């Protein structure tokens with residue numbers, strides 16, 4: 744069911760924060776553990792701020808904290824070009840339950856179209872189920888990202904789900920879950936943008952995990 748997939752997502756969601764060494768942590772959004780010490784996280788969380796690699800990355804797992812130098816996480820792309828969401832290996836994180844097999848297969852994408860979905864996310868750790876209207880797939884999705892100084896950048900990704908719904912700051916990094924039980928309520932991807940009553944999630948397929 745949607746709810747049982749949501750439970751698996753919830754257990755693997757951690758809070759992602761960034762701070763200077765010896766500084767205060769800025770909690771930015773969610774990251775989703777997928778397998779071993781690998782997580783999915785929107786790279787827009789960190790990559791557009793100055794000297795990201797000199798920062799400390801923080802992972803809050805239910806009130807237990809795991810920090811690491813940004814230079815010591817291994818970032819892997821989902822595909823060629825910029826997709827925002829990346830795979831990130833964090834050596835200090837406890838091993839995650841492998842949920843990769845709950846992600847949609849590339850070939851099954853059409854089966855999630857025109858059907859409801861649920862964004863399974865948190866706002867700073869408080870779990871939320873956010874209803875999304877019948878889904879469409881945008882071959883190229885463009886959305887705004889607001890940086891720390893209030894200025895904005897326009898990001899474009901390949902293959903992003905679009906659904907009617909209401910998002911709030913911090914929900915990025917949550918997982919979109921299909922209402923379609925015939926594909927076992929597959930995880931469709933990762934929430935990257937919200938606004939104007941539209942929710943955008945980068946498609947993440949099972950096949951993408953082959954990239955390590």
Ligand SMILES: *C[C@H](NC(=O)OCc1ccccc1)C(=O)O
Pocket residue numbers: 751841842844845
């Ligand atoms: C949610 C996970 N499920 C999973 O990996 O299913 C794989 C499967 C299930 C049934 C038949 C073939 C393959 C889990 O934690 O098990």
